[PDB]
Amino acid sequence: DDPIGLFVMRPQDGEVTVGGSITFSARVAGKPPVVKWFKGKWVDLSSKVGQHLQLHDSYDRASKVYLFELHITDAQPAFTGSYRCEVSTKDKFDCSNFNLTVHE
Amino acid sequence: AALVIDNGSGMCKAGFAGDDAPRAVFPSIVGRPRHQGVMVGMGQKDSYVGDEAQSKRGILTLKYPIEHGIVTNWDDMEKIWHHTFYNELRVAPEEHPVLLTEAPLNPKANREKMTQIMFETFNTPAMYVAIQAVLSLYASGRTTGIVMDSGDGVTHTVPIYEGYALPHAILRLDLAGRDLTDYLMKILTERGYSFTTTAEREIVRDIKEKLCYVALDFEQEMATAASSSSLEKSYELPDGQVITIGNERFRCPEALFQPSFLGMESCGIHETTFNSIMKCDVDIRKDLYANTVLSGGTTMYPGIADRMQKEITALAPSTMKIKIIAPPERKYSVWIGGSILASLSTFQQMWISKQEYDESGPSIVHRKCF
Amino acid sequence: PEPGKKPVSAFSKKPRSVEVAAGSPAVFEAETERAGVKVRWQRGGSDISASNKYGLATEGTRHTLTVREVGPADQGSYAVIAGSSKVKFDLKVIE
């Protein structure tokens, strides 16, 4: 099938109500791997961090899996769009596509 | 027409191209309710922007969106920009190109994100980022020389010859009017008066703008300050309390001349101007000294030019006569350069287009302009 | 034949053609049917706004355009758009 990256679990499409919070996550299998989040093909989410968007990373020793989370709060119309999650590893590079929808 | 906005510490200047005086001048501050309020009838208004904040200054915890020419929080800036285009200006971003002014050796993120917000949040066909030293030069009307730019933010020096540039020769100086205000508040504490609040921080700055003046010589007045008759004046606060100052007010502007009071290794403004000239070639040095231009928020006090002229003439070679030009309303001179710069037809072709940003990326700012 | 009735108009009063000598000031008065809307001005070649070489005065629902730069090359057509409605007028130049 398709080539294997370190995302054991790819991010999933999410639905969120007005003024709420939504969490998206990606798992990486086992230095720590670097994770980038994108809006569209060439727009980086990390440079868009503020009240509306937050980034957080967590590590689970038992499964040797790193949990990467994208936090979106008080979501607005302007944030509706396609988001791409890219994870880089010591020997390989991989990416995934997911969408954020906010209405009302 | 065109829109020119000055951004970068303490104040936001908003206006229209074709005017030598902007429509909207207000501080770049955002106020949030420090204390929770338990009352009925208030809209709560959890967000204050502009001069409204100045009136409700005590309860509100003021936060500056821009620190040292760098913006800490991007959405606060958006509110400021929104406020300038819609409330005082009463104009649409769609209608005209927007000009922004930026200091030299400033970090890449400020140019890239600022353009990114203008391209994405405020949709416009094109925008351009200009540098204060070049605009002042055009205002001056000279194509060759060295420009000393000291104002809100960071003091910078940028020599130019016949339009060719010398990046190595450009020097950045960590002095500013805002820095003097911090010095001033620090100096007040020894006298028994303490200001540790952002709200009252402005009040000392207000004092500095009209009460402070430049002495012919710092050391002689300070010496004569032991018995101060006419060196002390009474200032009235909104509070109604009375403040009296003496040698304290004239020693504030002095710090630019003598950074040792601030606690920094770097030499004062006259030594730095000299250093910039030394880097440049001897052949072009001769018109550099006679073409010194002063502009900015902290250059307002009379006599600065007279002190600079004698200090530069003494330290510098006697080969060439030293001429310094410092005209009134120099505080808004940088903004003025921007409004005139946008006016020229040739300049309009030069603006960084939205199409270009999306096709190549934020990294093309350096590529398009020096 | 022409259509029976025009689409909803945003101008209460249509600016009317006026004549001016070269170097003589020119003022065009246009009124909109709705307040709170910004009115753009355009000349037979480029857009017109409150900038050097042009002068715009607006108050409430009244818009005034003043041109001091007007001369022999200003003969042509002036277009003014208030929101959804577009209206144009002819400027005559006297030699």
From Swiss-Prot, chain A:
Gene from which this protein is expressed: MYBPC3
Where Zn(2+) is bound, by residue?
Answer: Q54, H56, E69, H71
Q: What does this protein do?
A: Thick filament-associated protein located in the crossbridge region of vertebrate striated muscle a bands. In vitro it binds MHC, F-actin and native thin filaments, and modifies the activity of actin-activated myosin ATPase. It may modulate muscle contraction or may play a more structural role.
Specify the taxonomic lineage.
Eukaryota, Metazoa, Chordata, Craniata, Vertebrata
- Disease linkage in the record? Cardiomyopathy, familial hypertrophic, 4: A hereditary heart disorder characterized by ventricular hypertrophy, which is usually asymmetric and often involves the interventricular septum. The symptoms include dyspnea, syncope, collapse, palpitations, and chest pain. They can be readily provoked by exercise. The disorder has inter- and intrafamilial variability ranging from benign to malignant forms with high risk of cardiac failure and sudden cardiac death.
What is the protein's given name? Myosin-binding protein C, cardiac-type
Coiled-coil features, chain-numbered ranges: none
Sequence similarity: Belongs to the immunoglobulin superfamily. MyBP family.
Q: How is it modified after translation?
A: Substrate for phosphorylation by PKA and PKC. Reversible phosphorylation appears to modulate contraction. Polyubiquitinated.
At the top level, the lineage of the source is Eukaryota
The region annotated as signal peptide is: none
Domain (Ig-like C2-type) ranges: 3-102
From Swiss-Prot, chain B:
Please give the Pfam families that the UniProt record associates with this protein. Actin
Catalyzed reactions: ATP + H2O = ADP + phosphate + H(+)
Q: What is its main location?
A: cytoplasm
GO terms, molecular function: ATP binding; hydrolase activity; identical protein binding; profilin binding; protein kinase binding; structural constituent of cytoskeleton; structural constituent of postsynaptic actin cytoskeleton; ubiquitin protein ligase binding
Q: What's the effect of swapping E311K?
A: In DFNA20; uncertain significance
Say what the protein does: Actins are highly conserved proteins that are involved in various types of cell motility and are ubiquitously expressed in all eukaryotic cells. May play a role in the repair of noise-induced stereocilia gaps thereby maintains hearing sensitivity following loud noise damage.
- Its protein name is Actin, cytoplasmic 2
Question: In which organism is this protein found?
Answer: Homo sapiens (Human)
Which lineage?
Eukaryota, Metazoa, Chordata, Craniata, Vertebrata
